[PDB]
Ligand binder design. Structure first.
Ligand code: MG
Ligand code: MG
Ligand code: MG
Ligand code: MG
Ligand code: MG
Ligand code: MG
Ligand code: MG
Ligand code: MG
Ligand code: MG
Ligand code: MG
Ligand code: MG
Ligand code: MG
Ligand code: MG
Ligand code: MG
Ligand code: MG
Lengths: 123, 46, 81, 156, 205, 79, 129
RNA sequence: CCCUG
RNA sequence: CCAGCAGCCGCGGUAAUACGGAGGGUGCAAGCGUUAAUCGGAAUUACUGGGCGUAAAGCGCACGCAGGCGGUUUGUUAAGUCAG
RNA sequence: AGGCAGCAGUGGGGAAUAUUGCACAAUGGGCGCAAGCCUGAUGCAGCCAUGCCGCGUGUAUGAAGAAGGCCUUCGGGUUGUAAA
């Protein structure tokens, strides 16, 4: 690219679009569960992964993965979601934060407690 | 305990065979330690 | 009017006064015409407490400026009244 | 006396009638730390054998270079195949600001104060070859001045 | 704000003596220095280069009792100053007040010196300073208060000081329990096992 | 002296007014190549002595019209 | 067509020097012989001469010290599509001062150090290192 | 002609 | 091959340093992780600082306006350029 | 009749952002000759680890190598001067 060509047409930058468009550059977003269910993952990993179809406060319709060891999320549950795509699940790019408004903490966890919304064991 | 989302949608003849022909009850591939699918590019701990 | 006055800078419980010609209509530490000196009320001994450019003060007061009460006092000490 | 150091050992593969033959290749750099440095690459069936491969090749290939109190004379570039390297002399106490392979080769060469950067492909083999190329075409002011026919005062 | 565990475990981790005890006995007698801490201590670690950098930086931090954010701001100031960055960093580190008390011999260890600084046992140029991170300027003169003249531990610290090696850039006396710091030390006045260019490599990563 | 500029008048077909192309030579900020830059000013020309494509000296004055703030000084050469 | 005879000079020197020619020949100009004068006084070429009246051919007779090329690297800077001008303090130190920058400044063409001593700037004609 | 993922 | 972890490569199939726990370490520390967002690494829009035979990339070929560049000498101006 | 995008605050939105505070003591403004009056500017106070910065949770001694866990080829090593 010669300098005269660059003067006539400047270099084009990458747009570099966002991975998580639903949060709209917010760290977390509150939603209500519209469908909690499970899904089989893509090859190679094979299990029954727990996801939930959520309607956010800005009207978007997303799918959010539920981590930890079992949940308590039912229909019309008010949860809080954060970014972070799950590799296996094709289409799930959000996590439910544990210890949220309705996402209760994972039972009997004494490591990664802050990640899974778990209080101190009283000892 | 969460519901499974079957990919057959509205089942009107037989849901057991429907879940068979769903990917949930699929036949699964095992990575051989040696044999045919034997080669590992990188180890578990290397 | 152009006015020699004291604008506060510094931190909490430790003021620092910049002596400055400024319009009287404007804010206390906002826009100003020209710094003419400083004032540290909390300056200890064995260092300067204040400096005033008496030449520019005389220039402005003869030019048409008014003098604030505190800076008038400080002119009295720097002329050693 | 002679400083000796491995950079990376790699496993490569033959395919035969029966199956696969796994062989290990290791490359090392040797240098006395006074600006006299070289490298050696060895292939063997097993890793310490590759190590003494790289040892004996590195000492027999090992060459000399000119240093100025622990740093280079001038900024220099080196290119070999797909790797480009750019190095500058540095002030006192800066260190070896370089990548892995470049770190190894300069800190066994005895350079102490260098800024460096690697562009292009970062294969360690090509990187160390490009670095030795940069050192060998790098030149010092005294031999430049003899090469000039003028004095060191005149050129400096 | 400080580490509150076993100093002999720390010296086991870096494999070398770090002057973290009183020194009335041998560290070999007090603990097993040559073996790594923890259950897998008999393993011989094939340390990566980043491991070497981290272990040397942590060795300096744990010898000098310096918190990591403290050490990073110290490195920033050392790069701000002119000259050899490692030399400026160790100049600041030696100019820390608690390290000055340790070198002067008013405290048995750097822990004791830092405790004395915290509990206000040190006058600096006739005005009291009770912060270990205070930088002692060259040609200053520091004192010990009468509250620690009557305290017995300073005599133990002093006799430990003359059995230990004398710093050459200090002038300390025990009769009036007083000292003078005239100049910033350099590398030959410091220890030879500190690898400062590797430290600046790690913080330039 | 008085601050005044050279230009090439290219249109005069409106009466008692000309427009002149001031041709300035500006280095590009990010590429460093010197780029020819043109600037058009409406200039009050009394008596309409200029033609198409002449070279004219102009000087900034008070606003004489909506787009006219410059007046002629002296014609440099006629075409 | 032909649009930089100075780049033609520097290229002719580079190619003849790589091919180990003793001497290289080109057409002449005042700027050309000025550059040749700079290199003769500063020590890359050993001699140069101009032959002819209406057709001046400049011939550059070169040197090799240990057999290899005296001119290690050589490059035109003030290229016609991109002109280079520097301030007083922005004269570049070519090759960390080992090489020179032929710079054309207001008192004539001179080397980088001569420009720095004189206190002038101008066109960085070429880096020769 | 084809060789379950 | 369930439960699960995951930023990437990927681990889990009855001998898991990758899951959950314990013990022991590592790193930070009144803070610690996660998410969001910008720059860097990215020489991955390359002015410094990239490329186009085969990896993406030479218009199918030519003429040509605007535009970009200009063999050589002398004199003149000093716009660019340089110095104060 | 009314216009908090003045200060504090309320409701709502949102993942989220504070007290319906004291004083003209200082700086500054308005008015006045001045005393003086007004000043939710300002000086301060209350809440929030929101960030940065500074300090604290102590100092030496202690094999009894205590237990109780962890591994075990059951010899032992580790937690461990760690603890009391
Ligand atoms: Mg690449
Ligand atoms: Mg802190
Ligand atoms: Mg108008
Ligand atoms: Mg078929
Ligand atoms: Mg198992
Ligand atoms: Mg870039
Ligand atoms: Mg490319
Ligand atoms: Mg192809
Ligand atoms: Mg192609
Ligand atoms: Mg073609
Ligand atoms: Mg020309
Ligand atoms: Mg000019
Ligand atoms: Mg309000
Ligand atoms: Mg709300
Ligand atoms: Mg009122």
């Amino acid at each position: 690219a010669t300098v005269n060509q660059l003067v006539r047409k400047p270099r084009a930058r990458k747009v570099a679009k966002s991975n998580v468009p639903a949060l709209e550059a917010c760290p977390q977003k509150r939603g209500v569960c519209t469908r909690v269910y499970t899904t089989t993952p893509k090859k190679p990993n094979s299990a029954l992964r727990k996801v939930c179809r959520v309607r956010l406060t800005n009207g978007f319709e997303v799918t959010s993965y539920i981590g930890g060891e079992g949940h308590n999320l039912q229909e019309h549950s008010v949860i809080l979601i954060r970014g972070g795509r799950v590799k296996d699940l094709p289409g799930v790019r959000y996590h439910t934060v544990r210890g949220a408004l309705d996402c209760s903490g994972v039972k009997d966890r004494k490591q990664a407690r802050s990640k899974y919304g778990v209080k101190r064991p009283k000892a | 305990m969460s519901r499974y989302q079957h990919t057959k949608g509205q089942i009107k003849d037989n849901a057991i065979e429907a879940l068979l022909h769903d990917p949930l009850f699929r036949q699964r591939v095992e990575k051989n330690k040696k044999g045919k699918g034997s080669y590992m590019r990188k180890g578990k701990h290397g | 009017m152009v006015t020699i006055r004291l604008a506060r800078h510094g931190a909490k419980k430790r003021p620092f006064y910049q002596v400055v010609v400024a319009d009287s209509r404007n804010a206390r530490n906002g826009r100003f015409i020209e710094r003419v000196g400083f004032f540290n009320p909390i300056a200890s001994e064995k260092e300067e407490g204040t400096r005033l450019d008496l030449d520019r003060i005389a220039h402005w007061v003869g030019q048409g400026a008014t003098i604030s009460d505190r800076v008038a006092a400080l002119i009295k000490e720097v002329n050693k009244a | 006396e002679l400083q000796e150091k491995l950079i990376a050992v790699n496993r490569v593969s033959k395919t035969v009638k029966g199956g696969r033959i796994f062989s290990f290749t290791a490359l090392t750099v040797v240098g006395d730390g006074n600006g006299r440095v070289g490298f050696g690459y060895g292939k063997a069936r097993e890793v310490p054998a590759a190590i003494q491969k790289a040892m004996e090749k590195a000492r027999r290939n090992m060459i000399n270079v000119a240093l100025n109190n622990g740093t280079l004379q001038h900024p220099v570039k080196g290119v070999h195949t797909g790797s480009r390297v750019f190095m500058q002399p540095a002030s006192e106490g800066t260190g070896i600001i370089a990548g892995g392979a470049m770190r190894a080769v300069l800190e066994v060469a005895g350079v102490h104060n260098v800024l460096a950067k690697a562009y292009g492909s970062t294969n360690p083999i090509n990187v160390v070859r490009a670095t030795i190329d940069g050192l060998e075409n790098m030149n010092s002011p005294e031999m430049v001045a003899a090469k000039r026919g003028k004095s060191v005062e005149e050129i400096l | 704000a400080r580490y509150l565990g076993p100093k002999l475990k720390l010296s086991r981790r870096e494999g070398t003596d770090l002057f973290l005890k009183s020194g009335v006995r041998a560290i070999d007698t007090k603990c097993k220095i040559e073996q790594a801490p923890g259950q897998h201590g008999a393993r011989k670690p094939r340390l990566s280069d980043y491991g070497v950098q981290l272990r040397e930086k942590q060795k300096v931090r744990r010898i000098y009792g310096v918190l990591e954010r403290q050490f990073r701001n110290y490195y920033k100031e050392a790069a701000r100053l002119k000259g050899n960055t490692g030399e400026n960093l160790l100049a600041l580190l030696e100019g820390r007040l608690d390290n000055v008390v340790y070198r002067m011999g008013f405290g048995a260890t750097r822990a004791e010196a830092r405790q004395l600084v915290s509990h206000k046992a040190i006058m600096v140029n006739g005005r009291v300073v009770n912060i270990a991170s205070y930088q002692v300027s060259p040609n200053d003169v520091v004192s010990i208060r009468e509250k620690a003249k009557k305290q017995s531990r300073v005599k133990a610290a002093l006799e430990l000081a003359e059995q230990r090696e004398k710093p050459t850039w200090l002038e300390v006396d025990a009769g009036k329990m007083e000292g003078t710091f005239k100049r910033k030390p350099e590398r030959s006045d410091l220890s030879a096992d500190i690898n400062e260019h590797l430290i600046v490599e790690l913080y330039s990563k | 002296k008085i601050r005044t500029l050279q230009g090439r008048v290219v249109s005069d077909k409106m009466e008692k007014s000309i427009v002149v192309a001031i041709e300035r030579f500006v280095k590009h900020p990010i590429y460093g190549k010197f780029i020819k830059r043109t600037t058009k000013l409406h200039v009050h020309d009394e008596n309409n002595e200029c033609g198409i494509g002449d070279v004219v000296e102009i000087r900034e004055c008070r606003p004489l019209s909506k787009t006219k703030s410059w007046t002629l000084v002296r014609v440099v050469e006629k075409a | 067509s032909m649009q930089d005879p100075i780049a033609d000079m520097l290229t002719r020197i580079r190619n003849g020097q790589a091919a180990n020619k003793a001497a290289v020949t080109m057409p002449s100009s005042k700027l050309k012989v000025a550059i040749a004068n700079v290199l003769k006084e500063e020590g890359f070429i050993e001699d140069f001469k101009v032959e002819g009246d209406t057709k001046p051919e400049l011939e550059l007779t070169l040197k090799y010290f240990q057999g290899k090329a005296v001119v290690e690297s050589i490059q035109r800077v003030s290229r016609p599509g991109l002109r280079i001008y520097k301030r007083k303090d922005e004269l570049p130190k070519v090759m960390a001062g080992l090489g020179i920058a032929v710079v054309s400044t207001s008192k004539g063409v001179m080397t980088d150090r001569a420009a720095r001593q004189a206190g002038l700037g101008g066109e960085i004609i070429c880096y020769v290192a």
